[PDB]
Design an enzyme around this catalytic site. Structure first.
Site, mmCIF file in Angstrom:
data_model
loop_
_atom_site.group_PDB
_atom_site.id
_atom_site.type_symbol
_atom_site.label_atom_id
_atom_site.label_comp_id
_atom_site.label_asym_id
_atom_site.label_seq_id
_atom_site.Cartn_x
_atom_site.Cartn_y
_atom_site.Cartn_z
ATOM 1 N N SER A 17 37.527 60.214 -10.608
ATOM 2 C CA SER A 17 37.214 59.006 -10.539
ATOM 3 C C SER A 17 38.462 57.939 -10.820
ATOM 4 O O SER A 17 39.090 58.123 -11.801
ATOM 5 C CB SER A 17 36.464 58.733 -12.093
ATOM 6 O OG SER A 17 35.091 59.006 -11.910
ATOM 7 N N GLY A 18 38.755 57.506 -9.766
ATOM 8 C CA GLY A 18 39.706 56.525 -9.570
ATOM 9 C C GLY A 18 39.593 55.080 -10.122
ATOM 10 O O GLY A 18 38.766 54.856 -10.758
ATOM 11 N N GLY A 21 36.652 53.719 -8.099
ATOM 12 C CA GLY A 21 35.266 54.241 -8.081
ATOM 13 C C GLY A 21 35.650 55.821 -8.097
ATOM 14 O O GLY A 21 36.453 56.472 -9.031
ATOM 15 N N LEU A 22 34.519 56.640 -7.345
ATOM 16 C CA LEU A 22 34.821 57.958 -7.239
ATOM 17 C C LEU A 22 35.660 58.582 -6.394
ATOM 18 O O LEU A 22 35.786 57.824 -5.045
ATOM 19 C CB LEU A 22 33.470 58.710 -7.177
ATOM 20 C CG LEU A 22 32.910 59.311 -8.480
ATOM 21 C CD1 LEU A 22 32.499 58.260 -9.464
ATOM 22 C CD2 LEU A 22 31.706 60.161 -8.080
ATOM 23 N N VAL A 23 36.114 59.807 -6.300
ATOM 24 C CA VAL A 23 36.924 60.707 -5.163
ATOM 25 C C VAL A 23 36.190 61.833 -5.143
ATOM 26 O O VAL A 23 35.794 62.510 -6.065
ATOM 27 C CB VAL A 23 38.296 60.819 -5.405
ATOM 28 C CG1 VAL A 23 38.836 61.314 -4.158
ATOM 29 C CG2 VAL A 23 38.960 59.615 -5.894
ATOM 30 N N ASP A 128 53.669 48.911 -4.749
ATOM 31 C CA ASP A 128 53.464 49.459 -5.982
ATOM 32 C C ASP A 128 53.765 51.191 -5.982
ATOM 33 O O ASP A 128 52.998 51.915 -6.263
ATOM 34 C CB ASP A 128 52.128 49.225 -6.268
ATOM 35 C CG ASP A 128 51.521 49.765 -7.714
ATOM 36 O OD1 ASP A 128 52.551 49.823 -8.720
ATOM 37 O OD2 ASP A 128 50.451 49.738 -8.140
#
Ligand SMILES: CCCOc1ccc2cccc(-n3cc(NC(N)=O)c(C(N)=O)n3)c2c1
Length: 264
Positions: A17-18, A21-23, A128
């Site tokens: 979970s990034g 959202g989800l990975v 970044d």
């Protein structure tokens, strides 16, 4: 093309979970095993992103994580990447702490520097660069990912220099003061990244608030030499942290300098 139809993707396993959202680990029809990142609605300016896709998808390098395309038929959209078996570099360093040879840590910095020299040549600014944004693949190769993505991030608390969540720890003074981004501000971030690698994943300026980092940097404070970094490597880190961007080495120069140390 950069558009991937929902029928060309299969989701196999949730891998994490990034921020957006989800990975998932999945497969991409007639192509390969992929990492699929689901993007929550409102997290990014999708139209600005999609607009740049035909040009930006062409960027390719063995030390950059390939972003193959976007599945955008319905919300939430999905980003489809090359699969990086060992996950993010920040977590990898932390879990494998005490098992790294100094040559491997220098090698990790060289992989990142190589990918960054490719971006610098292409006039692509990361904005970044940090160990959290680097991924570890087959044979522990390091690849840079998420370059330029903060230009699409809709949370002003992360993107604005005065934002509560602004990534000040990796920011050069002209970035934290004016959002004056360049390959030279990526060089500063790279120096911090070298420190994260040589410290085996410690958090830079762990004992400081965002304003305290700004005050410390502005008055000459620099991150202490990690035990595993040689004085020669630490000299290169400090070159990345020169106050004036003009005085910092280009990634092309750093790559030659770091290679000479690695191959000596
Ligand atoms: C969906 C096809 C790629 O589309 C884009 C669109 C806008 C972009 C703006 C900045 C950077 C992009 N970007 C990010 C990439 N990879 C990554 N691991 O983050 C790539 C690439 N060629 O691998 N291009 C972008 C990639």
């Amino acid at each position: 093309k950069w558009v991937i139809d929902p029928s060309e993707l299969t989701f196999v396993q949730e891998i994490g979970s990034g921020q957006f959202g989800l990975v998932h680990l999945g497969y991409w029809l007639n192509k390969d095993k992929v990492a699929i990142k689901t993007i929550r609605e409102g997290a990014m300016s999708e139209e600005d992103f999609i607009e740049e896709a035909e040009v930006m998808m062409k960027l390719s390098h063995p030390k950059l994580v390939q972003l193959y395309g976007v599945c955008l038929e319905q919300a939430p959209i999905c980003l489809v990447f090359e699969f990086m078996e060992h996950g993010c570099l920040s977590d990898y360093l932390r879990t494998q702490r005490g098992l790294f040879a100094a040559e491997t840590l220098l090698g990790m910095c060289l992989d990142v520097c190589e990918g960054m020299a490719y971006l610098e040549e292409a006039c692509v600014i990361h904005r970044d660069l940090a160990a959290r944004n680097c991924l570890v693949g087959e044979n522990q190769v390091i690849k840079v990912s998420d370059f330029g993505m903060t230009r699409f991030v809709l949370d002003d608390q992360y993107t604005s220099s005065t934002g509560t969540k602004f990534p000040v720890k990796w920011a050069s003074p002209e970035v934290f003061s004016f959002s004056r981004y360049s390959s030279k501000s990526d060089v500063w971030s790279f120096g911090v990244l070298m420190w994260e690698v040589f410290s085996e994943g410690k958090i830079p300026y762990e004992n400081r608030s965002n304003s305290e980092v700004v005050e410390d940097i502005s008055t000459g404070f620099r991150l202490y030499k990690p035990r595993l970094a040689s004085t020669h490597v630490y000299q290169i880190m400090n070159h990345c942290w020169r106050e004036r961007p003009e005085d910092r080495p280009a990634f092309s120069r750093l790559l030659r300098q770091l290679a000479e140390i690695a191959e000596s």
